[PDB]
C-alpha cells in the first residue's frame, strides 16, 4: 500500500526499469553507443552494448528521483571511476558527458525528467508516477 522506488532494491529496481525501456522502444539511443567507453577512465566499452544505455538511463531516473536536482556534471563524477594511468598510480576520472547528457535530454522527451531551477534536472510528476508504478510491479514479483 503505497510503494516508492526507495522501497525497492536498487539493483533489482534499475534492472527492471531498464527492461521497461527496451520493451518501450521510444527512448532515443544516440548514434554511437557501440563505440563509447562511458568514461575516459574506462578501458573497454560496456559489454551488453544493447542495454547499458537503458541500465544507465534507468539508474539516473532512479538517481535523480531520490534528490532535488542533479546536473550532468555530478553524473559524470558519479559514473566515473578509477583510471589505470599505466606505470603511475590510480586516480579518479570523471565520466563522458555527452553520454549522461543525451540521457538527460532524451529522458526529457519521454517526460521522466525536466529542466529545473537551481540548474540541473528534476524528476517529473509524469516520471515520479512512472517510477513509483514500475516500482510496485517489482515489489509484487511474488507471483
Amino acid at each position: 500500500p503505497g510503494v516508492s522506488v526507495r522501497d525497492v532494491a536498487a539493483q533489482d529496481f534499475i534492472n527492471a526499469y531498464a527492461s521497461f525501456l527496451q520493451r518501450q522502444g521510444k527512448l532515443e539511443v544516440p548514434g554511437y553507443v557501440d563505440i563509447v567507453k562511458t568514461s575516459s577512465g574506462n578501458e573497454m566499452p560496456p559489454q551488453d552494448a544493447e542495454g547499458w544505455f537503458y541500465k544507465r538511463a534507468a539508474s539516473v531516473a532512479r538517481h535523480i528521483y531520490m534528490r532535488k536536482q542533479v546536473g550532468v556534471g555530478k553524473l559524470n563524477k558519479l559514473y566515473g571511476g578509477a583510471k589505470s594511468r599505466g606505470v603511475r598510480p590510480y586516480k579518479h576520472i570523471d565520466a563522458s558527458g555527452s553520454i549522461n547528457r543525451k540521457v538527460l535530454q532524451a529522458l526529457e522527451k519521454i517526460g521522466i525528467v525536466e529542466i529545473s531551477p537551481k540548474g540541473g534536472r528534476r524528476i517529473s510528476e509524469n516520471g515520479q508516477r512512472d517510477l513509483d508504478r514500475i516500482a510496485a510491479q517489482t515489489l509484487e514479483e511474488d507471483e
Binding site: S4, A9, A10
Partner: protein, 142 residues
C-alpha cells in the same frame, strides 16, 4: 499536535547516525528506505541485531527514522545499529516505565558490540618522517 518523539544518535569513526523514535505503527527506515534494504549486504544482520536482542514486538509501537552522514560504508552500519539500540531505551526512559528499560539495557549489553557505548577509537595523525601513523620511511645508512 506534534507526537511523543525521541531522538538519539550513534557515532562510529566519522559517521553520525541521527535517530527519531516517535509513538507509531512500526516502520523502521534509514535514509528514506526501509531497514530491510540496508545494502552493504553481508552486514545486514548487524543492523537487525537491535531488533532481535529485545523482541520484535517492542517496535510495533514506534516509528524509527534514521539518517547517516559521514564515515564510510562500514562505519555507517555500526552507527545506525547504535542509534537504533539507543532510541529504544530513550523511548522507555521518557514514555514508559524503568524496569523494562534496564532489561533492554540488560539484553543489549549482554552481547554489546558498541550498541549503546560509542567506540571511541580514532585515526592517529601521520608524522613527518613516515607515510603513516607509526610507519617510518625506509632508512638506508651507507
Amino acid at each position: 499536535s506534534a507526537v511523543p518523539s525521541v531522538q538519539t544518535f550513534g557515532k562510529k569513526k566519522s559517521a553520525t547516525a541521527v535517530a527519531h523514535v516517535k509513538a507509531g505503527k512500526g516502520l523502521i527506515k534509514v535514509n528514506g528506505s526501509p531497514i530491510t534494504l540496508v545494502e552493504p549486504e553481508i552486514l545486514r544482520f548487524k543492523v537487525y541485531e537491535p531488533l532481535l536482542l529485545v523482541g520484535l514486538d517492542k517496535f510495533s509501537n514506534i516509528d524509527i527514522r534514521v539518517r547517516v552522514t559521514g564515515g564510510g560504508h562500514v562505519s555507517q552500519v555500526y552507527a545506525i545499529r547504535q542509534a537504533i539500540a539507543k532510541g529504544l531505551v530513550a523511548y522507555h526512559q521518557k514514555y514508559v516505565d524503568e524496569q523494562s528499560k534496564n532489561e533492554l539495557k540488560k539484553a543489549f549489553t549482554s552481547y554489546d558490540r558498541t550498541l549503546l557505548i560509542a567506540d571511541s577509537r580514532r585515526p592517529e595523525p601521520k608524522k613527518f618522517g613516515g607515510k603513516g601513523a607509526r610507519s617510518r620511511f625506509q632508512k638506508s645508512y651507507r
